[PDB]
Design a binder for this molecule. Structure first.
Ligand SMILES: [Ca+2]
Ligand SMILES: [Ca+2]
Ligand SMILES: [Ca+2]
Ligand SMILES: [Ca+2]
Lengths: 99, 43, 93
């Protein structure tokens, strides 16, 4: 019954907790868990800067309420931004582009 | 489907704030501020 | 591609399945949003038909006030749904 989009939403939820529940606050991603999730679940989105200083900068900017963790809402804000990049790729093509 | 009315509405009451948060992050990524992530979709 | 990477692409593809039907090729009008919700998110429909409720949802999502739902606003919509599903995930173990 579930549509692809409905299943997609379930993946957003389940992937988060695959990593958040490893250490400390089981409902938030610490630096280590975030790095795991990104590296294992979003490999196509990893940039040319792989250093800790670069990752720290991302962590800090995702951690909007400044509690040193990434909660589900902050995680969704990041996912949205990624989806938007993919959409910009999508909309660059002519309307009848083959697919 | 749901057992109630207006749950989607409840869920989107802070949509404005979230949009402003997303815009901020998207902008940082676009500006190349966060090179740990790709600036544009890649292969 | 991981399940998560594929899921994000499904979000993109589903949007354009409906956005291209009328008016602006890259935004959802009221009619297109209603279609997307009904056909792709039936699990989130209200218990009874309620036009006033739907109009209210449209208003909530239309953050930039242009009478349409663009892709970013649609992501916020999907995020809001995921956040509710997450409340369920966490609230009742
Ligand atoms: Ca944790
Ligand atoms: Ca935080
Ligand atoms: Ca349209
Ligand atoms: Ca709008």
């Amino acid at each position: 019954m579930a549509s692809p989009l409905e299943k997609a939403l379930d993946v957003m939820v389940s992937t988060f907790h695959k990593y958040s529940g490893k250490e400390g606050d089981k409902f938030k991603l610490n630096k280590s868990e975030l790095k795991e999730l990104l590296t294992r679940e979003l490999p196509s989105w990893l940039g040319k800067r792989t250093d800790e200083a670069a990752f720290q900068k991302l962590m800090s900017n995702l951690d909007s309420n400044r509690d040193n963790e990434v909660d589900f809402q902050e995680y969704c804000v990041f996912l949205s931004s990624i989806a938007m990049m993919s959409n910009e790729f999508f909309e660059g093509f002519p309307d009848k582009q083959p697919r | 489907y749901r057992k109630l009315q207006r749950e989607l509405e409840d869920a989107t009451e802070t949509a404005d704030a979230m949009n402003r948060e997303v815009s901020s992050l998207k902008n940082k990524l676009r500006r190349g501020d966060l090179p740990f992530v790709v600036p544009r979709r890649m292969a």
